[PDB]
Write an enzyme that holds these catalytic residues in place. Sequence first.
Site, PDB file in Angstrom:
ATOM      1  CE  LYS B  56      13.299 -15.310   1.850  1.00 13.66           C
ATOM      2  NZ  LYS B  56      13.673 -15.096   3.306  1.00 13.66           N
ATOM      3  CD  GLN B 100      11.558 -13.665   5.747  1.00 10.87           C
ATOM      4  OE1 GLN B 100      11.946 -14.560   5.103  1.00 10.87           O
ATOM      5  NE2 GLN B 100      11.969 -12.749   5.394  1.00 10.87           N
ATOM      6  CG  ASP B 123      17.995 -17.831   6.566  1.00  8.44           C
ATOM      7  OD1 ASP B 123      17.874 -18.007   5.112  1.00  8.44           O
ATOM      8  OD2 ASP B 123      16.729 -17.648   7.080  1.00  8.44           O
TER       9      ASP B 123
HETATM   10  N1  9L9 Z   1      15.304 -15.916   8.011  1.00  5.36           N
HETATM   11  C1  9L9 Z   1      15.484 -14.617   7.296  1.00  5.36           C
HETATM   12  N2  9L9 Z   1      14.922 -13.455   7.501  1.00  5.36           N
HETATM   13  C2  9L9 Z   1      15.202 -12.658   6.368  1.00  5.36           C
HETATM   14  N3  9L9 Z   1      14.621 -10.937   6.474  1.00  5.36           N
HETATM   15  C3  9L9 Z   1      15.817 -12.636   5.258  1.00  5.36           C
HETATM   16  N4  9L9 Z   1      15.910 -11.794   4.033  1.00  5.36           N
HETATM   17  C4  9L9 Z   1      15.055 -11.809   2.883  1.00  5.36           C
HETATM   18  O1  9L9 Z   1      14.260 -12.704   2.953  1.00  5.36           O
HETATM   19  N5  9L9 Z   1      15.258 -10.870   2.137  1.00  5.36           N
HETATM   20  C5  9L9 Z   1      14.829 -10.694   0.983  1.00  5.36           C
HETATM   21  C6  9L9 Z   1      15.133  -9.219   0.316  1.00  5.36           C
HETATM   22  C7  9L9 Z   1      14.445  -8.972  -0.735  1.00  5.36           C
HETATM   23  C8  9L9 Z   1      13.739  -9.930  -1.579  1.00  5.36           C
HETATM   24  C9  9L9 Z   1      13.106  -9.457  -2.889  1.00  5.36           C
HETATM   25  O2  9L9 Z   1      13.208 -10.397  -3.684  1.00  5.36           O
HETATM   26  N6  9L9 Z   1      12.864  -8.395  -3.136  1.00  5.36           N
HETATM   27  C10 9L9 Z   1      12.608  -7.779  -4.447  1.00  5.36           C
HETATM   28  C11 9L9 Z   1      11.451  -6.720  -4.375  1.00  5.36           C
HETATM   29  C12 9L9 Z   1       9.981  -7.581  -4.272  1.00  5.36           C
HETATM   30  C13 9L9 Z   1       8.933  -6.712  -4.045  1.00  5.36           C
HETATM   31  O3  9L9 Z   1       8.731  -5.937  -2.959  1.00  5.36           O
HETATM   32  O4  9L9 Z   1       7.929  -6.775  -4.665  1.00  5.36           O
HETATM   33  C14 9L9 Z   1      13.617  -7.045  -5.088  1.00  5.36           C
HETATM   34  O5  9L9 Z   1      14.567  -6.567  -4.187  1.00  5.36           O
HETATM   35  O6  9L9 Z   1      13.802  -7.092  -6.113  1.00  5.36           O
HETATM   36  C15 9L9 Z   1      13.831 -11.352  -1.022  1.00  5.36           C
HETATM   37  C16 9L9 Z   1      14.140 -11.405   0.346  1.00  5.36           C
HETATM   38  C17 9L9 Z   1      16.268 -13.892   4.929  1.00  5.36           C
HETATM   39  O7  9L9 Z   1      17.059 -14.334   3.917  1.00  5.36           O
HETATM   40  N7  9L9 Z   1      16.269 -15.040   5.941  1.00  5.36           N
END
Ligand code: 9L9
Lengths: 297, 297
Positions: B56, B100, B123
């Site tokens: 992020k 988060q 969010d």
């Molecule tokens: N407050 C809050 N809590 C949370 N738990 C979330 N979710 C929340 O950030 N999810 C999330 C899921 C996947 C990825 C992401 O980019 N994943 C990569 C993998 C990155 C890696 O493992 O290297 C992918 O799916 O391609 C980023 C954010 C949110 O949006 N807000």
Amino acid sequence: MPEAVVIDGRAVAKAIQKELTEEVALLERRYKGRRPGLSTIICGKRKDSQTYVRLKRKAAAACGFRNFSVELPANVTQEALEREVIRLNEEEACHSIVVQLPLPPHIDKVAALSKIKPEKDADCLLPVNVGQLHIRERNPAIVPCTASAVMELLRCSGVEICGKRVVVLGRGDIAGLPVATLLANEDATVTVVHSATPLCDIADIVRASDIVVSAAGQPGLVRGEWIKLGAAVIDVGTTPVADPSKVPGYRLVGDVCFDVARKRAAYITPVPGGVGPVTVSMLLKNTLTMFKRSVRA
Amino acid sequence: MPEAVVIDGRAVAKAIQKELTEEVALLERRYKGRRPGLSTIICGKRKDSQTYVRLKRKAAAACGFRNFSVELPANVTQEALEREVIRLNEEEACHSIVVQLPLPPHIDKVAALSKIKPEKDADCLLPVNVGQLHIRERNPAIVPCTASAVMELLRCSGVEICGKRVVVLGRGDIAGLPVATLLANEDATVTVVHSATPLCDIADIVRASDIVVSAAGQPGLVRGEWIKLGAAVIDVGTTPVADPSKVPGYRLVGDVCFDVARKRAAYITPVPGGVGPVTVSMLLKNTLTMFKRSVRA
Ligand SMILES: Nc1nc(N)c(NC(=O)Nc2ccc(C(=O)N[C@@H](CCC(=O)O)C(=O)O)cc2)c(=O)[nH]1
Ligand SMILES: NC(=O)c1ccc[n+]([C@@H]2O[C@H](COP(=O)([O-])OP(=O)(O)OC[C@H]3O[C@@H](n4cnc5c(N)ncnc54)[C@H](OP(=O)(O)O)[C@@H]3O)[C@@H](O)[C@H]2O)c1
Ligand SMILES: Nc1nc(N)c(NC(=O)Nc2ccc(C(=O)N[C@@H](CCC(=O)O)C(=O)O)cc2)c(=O)[nH]1
């Protein structure tokens, strides 16, 4: 032969209102002179809206509430409507404000409703209030009246909800929408459908549902033969249908084919006389709850 | 040998971010230096959480945003957490706050999130902002990030939603809940499955579904055999599953049995590389919208 229990909404409303009346007479004696104040605003002259407002005022008066009744023309300007809402916001003796829907087309509904003070939003129409219903870890102050009435009629039936398949037809802001949320909070598996959803899907979904809440405003939408044997069926529809023998030239017809549905359901509610009277009773309940909150000072 | 289109989340996310970057550049010239400020608060050291906040922050920096990065310990108290949120509410240069999830178990999630100022709720977790989601006649400003990313991918694929049968697995506040709301606003037939739904019913529901959106966080939950020929399958699951060949000791696994589902579906998302990157993009979009609103003052 066995048939559905027909839940008598008028009797349910009667019992609730009997308890509210005694609660008010006690509270008045405890809070020297104070008593719940309900405001209802009606714009225009839809006969069904007129009826529902009259019933709310009458119920409120019977339970010892004070009424602030407002009538505006179909014409009303955005500004005149909002000014009237604001006036009621500053009236100490008014604890609830009800803006009877539908509003006239030319009005900006969201704008106007947004002027209502959150503590007086008896219909739970404001985002700050409706946005609470999904929080299961907190019990919300206010719940929309129609949704509330459905849950009260399910309580009266005593049917299990957890683990059951539920269909809600319609997604109205004070009916279908909030009720789907409240049903899922009780751990039902909820499916939402619409009046114009393909019929083959509606049939399939209704056939699999332990609980049917129809709030689509489409007479005869829910065929009796789709109803799962032993289901609980809650009919929220209140659609005007032409009948030259009745006072206003129409009768109110529910969403459900009741005559066939009653042979298959375990529980069913009639229209008129089911959800509607309890909807009025829930408005009075919200208002008494809001009254008590404001009097804690 | 014919197979689903594998939707490329990374490419969507990059397209969105190049747009956001241009937009920020011009606003920074218009408002003589001001720029969108994003705060990301992480409690403890979950490796997956650390990755997601790092992604992020990195994307925010690349788009020209200011970062307010806060790291709190796993044993942070309720007060210290809320105090940090409050600090960020009062910081004029901060326009969005992300707390988060998941928080440490001793923390009351609802009480903590309730401290966030509504206009900085990145969010879309607070009642006042959850409560706008159904209001179609207005285009809300803030949209829940995972949910809007799901809608974005469906839109990219050209998938029909109105009148289609949709199943959402899970009802968590970040993923399941708002996804279901957004799909319901499209007048899809929406069923939500959760942990009180018997497994046999899940299978039946998934088989009947034109669109499957899985946000349960249970790898292998959605069997490929259940997938309706021609369906669109969106995997929002991101469960760490042990794998000592990978940097953090785990790989990310989706809810969907991808290799089997790919032979039946028309569209599917990979995990990783699907919904995840777009979720980040949608956070930045919100944050830019909140900035624009803020500087109108
Ligand atoms: N407050 C809050 N809590 C949370 N738990 C979330 N979710 C929340 O950030 N999810 C999330 C899921 C996947 C990825 C992401 O980019 N994943 C990569 C993998 C990155 C890696 O493992 O290297 C992918 O799916 O391609 C980023 C954010 C949110 O949006 N807000
Ligand atoms: N932890 C992270 O870093 C992270 C962050 C964002 C997204 N994600 C991924 O996206 C998903 C979104 O979940 P969330 O973070 O919003 O909250 P969550 O509490 O993980 O949500 C899980 C939801 O799926 C339901 N569920 C779990 N197992 C199930 C099963 N076997 N059958 C049916 N339903 C089941 C739960 O039901 P109940 O409501 O009945 O408990 C709950 O509603 C996660 O599960 C995860 O894979 C992970
Ligand atoms: N703001 C606002 N607008 C709204 N449109 C509603 N709906 C909103 O009052 N509905 C409603 C429906 C039926 C009855 C009712 O009691 N009907 C009687 C019979 C009516 C009649 O005599 O014709 C019955 O069903 O037994 C009362 C209220 C509301 O609750 N709040």
